[PDB]
């Protein structure tokens, strides 16, 4: 019936390996860019 | 300090950075395949054809 | 000109303008994500749709094998096959998430960008809908009689609106044929109206979740949410291609895999998961017609939520009322879904008509009537 | 010294001091329209 | 008796927009009336109305929210746009009414 199966077994794994490192690397990435909203600080200073 | 020369090196300029891609891209496949094959394989001792091949292949009528 | 070619040029200033020095809400949250899948995810179908369809044969004599051959003898073609059968479903729930969130954070007030929206949404279920046929296997076949048998329900243009669109007189070849054509048609209507909409939203820009206006803090679209966006896509795809790589037909009936035949009616006809909350509520109206419009409403609802919106506020974020009740109507879908995957029997029937009862009475009457009262507790 | 710069210094001494650098930035007033550290520290490379 | 401000106050603190340090008229949606009351606001009430809601955007993009020390409670809630709203709306029945007769 699915002659595949074995071939889109192994495929399965290269896709989770690297699905995995790819993932965490991006994670980190957005999380560079957006540090500087993320930190970022604000006051308020009226000329009172 | 590998870090400060790998920006140097590498990194800094963008055009290296890009052909470091490649390359990278290049061993890294080669490798990663390789290994996942092997884990793969590793996986299913003698469920594979590669493995229980030899039975049939040359040594019969 | 302008000093970069970025926003001087007839094109550039397109991607530019819209996907880069686009002005996007500094605290929009990940529930806005959906909107770039739902574009990835299409042109992915698209994508993977063409490579079929120079493989498939429109023909009932053909249909069932041309699939068998493509997935058994064209290189990865089993994969491809996949890969959109499953996309279907990665598409439906990035689209439901993506109305969802519409609705809990008042987004439909942007009536164009929605009622585009609503329009994008129904042409994509008549896109599945021919699609599912394609295959022609036992649901294909099932699936489009039964459905389209619904038409004749209709008065007086209704034995007719049907033996039209069947081209005969039952779902035969003539049939097969125009749907293989509409399925390679509408997903570029889609696109097309993907465009319209994304145009309506521009004008008035992104809403954002708290509700309030964001020009007090805005941020360039990249990289921002370029980065978050593709994050947003890994995260996603990797559960996808983990059950269209691992599970391949948790989803499917396996009715399917048995070639159409019109000399037996299988035991439970079924849509897939996407379509069950609407078959559920087809089904509560025992009356053919009153059915139908049932259904009809059922997702034509959309196109009032904006007209039902009675608080002072734009999101849920601050009405702990609507919140309860808006994941009242989540939950209530689930069990609607369930339902439209059980057969036609107690308790199911009765369970059944109540969810369809609720479901309308949660959109049409207590979201507008809960929002009012909440008005008047914030003393307005 | 001023006679001993070329060309070539310059551009050696500025990539070292300028290029990929992160830098320091004061906007004072109606600056709605400059935005994004993010956007101006890319502008910190590549011709 | 009480049972009114009960409710009006818990619901208030249901609603939890002061958690952002945000009043009750900060989270108004803007529709027609409410822009025209906002032109209308004292250039301070203004000002103070814009840095509360950049403030609680800027918490919202964090992820995070005012420290309880910080917000605001059902009664020191300042409703400062509603009269200028009101009037608004009252100017606009006004003029609608009159163009019908
Ligand atoms: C329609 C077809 C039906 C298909 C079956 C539906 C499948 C149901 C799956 C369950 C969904 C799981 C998601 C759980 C998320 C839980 C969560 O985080 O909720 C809290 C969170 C907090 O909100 P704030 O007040 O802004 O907080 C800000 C302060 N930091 O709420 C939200 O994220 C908002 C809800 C948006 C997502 C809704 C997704 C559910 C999808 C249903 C579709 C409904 C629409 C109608 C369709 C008609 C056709
Ligand atoms: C396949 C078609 C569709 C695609 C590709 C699409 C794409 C987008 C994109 C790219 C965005 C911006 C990012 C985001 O907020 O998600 C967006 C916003 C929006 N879409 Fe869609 N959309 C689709 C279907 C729909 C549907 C079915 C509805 C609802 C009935 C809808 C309602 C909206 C609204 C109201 C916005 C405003 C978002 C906000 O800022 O609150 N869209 N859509
Ligand atoms: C809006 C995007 C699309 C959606 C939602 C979609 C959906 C579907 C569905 C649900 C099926 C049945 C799949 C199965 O379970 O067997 C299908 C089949 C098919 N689709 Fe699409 N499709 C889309 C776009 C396309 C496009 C643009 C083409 C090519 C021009 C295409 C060509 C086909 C073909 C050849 C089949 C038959 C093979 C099969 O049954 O898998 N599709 N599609
Ligand atoms: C051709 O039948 N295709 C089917 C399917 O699930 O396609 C994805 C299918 C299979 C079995 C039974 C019913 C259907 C289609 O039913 C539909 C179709 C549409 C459009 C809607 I709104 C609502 C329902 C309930
Ligand atoms: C069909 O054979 C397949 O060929 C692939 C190479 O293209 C291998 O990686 C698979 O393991 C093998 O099953």
Known sequence: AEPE????????????????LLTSLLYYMKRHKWSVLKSRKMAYRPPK | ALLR???????????????????????????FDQGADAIFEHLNEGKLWKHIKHKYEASEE | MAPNIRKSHPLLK???????????????????????????????????????????????????????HTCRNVQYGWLIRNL?????????????????????????????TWNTGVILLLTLMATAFVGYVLPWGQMSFWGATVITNLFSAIPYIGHTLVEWAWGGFSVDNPTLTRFFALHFLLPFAIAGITIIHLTFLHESGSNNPLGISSDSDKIPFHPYYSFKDILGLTLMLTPFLTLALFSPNLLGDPENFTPANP??????????????????????????????????????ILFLI??????????????????????????????????????????????????????????????????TLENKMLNY | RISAVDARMVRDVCSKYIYDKCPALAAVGPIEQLL???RIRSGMYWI | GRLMDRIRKWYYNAAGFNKYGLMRDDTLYEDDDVKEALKRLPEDLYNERMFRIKRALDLSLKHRILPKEQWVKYE?????????????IRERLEREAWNKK
């Open chain 1, 5 to 20: 199966h074995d071939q889109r077994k192994r495929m399965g794994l290269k896709m989770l390996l690297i699905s995995a």
């Open chain 2, 5 to 31: 020369q790998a920006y140097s090196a590498l990194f800094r300029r963008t055009s290296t950075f890009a052909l470091t891609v490649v390359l990278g891209a290049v061993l890294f496949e080669r490798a």
């Open chain 3, 14 to 68: 397109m991607i530019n303008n819209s996907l880069i020095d686009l002005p996007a809400p500094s605290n929009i949250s990940a529930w806005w994500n959906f909107g770039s899948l739902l574009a990835v995810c299409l042109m992915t179908q698209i994508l993977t749709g063409l490579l079929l369809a120079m493989h498939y044969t429109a023909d009932t004599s053909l249909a069932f094998s041309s699939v068998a």
């Open chain 3, 84 to 112: 959109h059968a499953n996309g279907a479903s990665f598409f439906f729930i990035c689209i439901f998430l993506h109305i969802g969130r519409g609705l809990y954070y008042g987004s439909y007030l942007y009536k164009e």
């Open chain 3, 263 to 300: 000399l037996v009616t299988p035991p439970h006809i079924k849509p897939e998961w996407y379509f069950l909350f609407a078959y559920a509520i087809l089904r509560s109206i025992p009356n053919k017609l009153g059915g139908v419009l049932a259904l009809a409403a059922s997702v034509l």
């Open chain 3, 306 to 371: 904006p007209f039902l919106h009675k608080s002072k506020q734009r999101t849920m974020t601050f009405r702990p009322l609507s919140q309860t009740l808006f994941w009242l109507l989540v939950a209530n879908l689930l069990i609607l879904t369930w339902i439209g995957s059980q057969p036609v029997e107690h308790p199911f029937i009765i369970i059944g008509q109540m969810a369809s009862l609720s479901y309308f009475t949660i959109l049409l009457i207590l979201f507008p009537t809960i929002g």
């Open chain 4, 36 to 38: 994004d550290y993010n």
């Open chain 5, 76 to 88: 020191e809630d300042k409703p400062y746009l509603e009269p200028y709203l009101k009037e608004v």
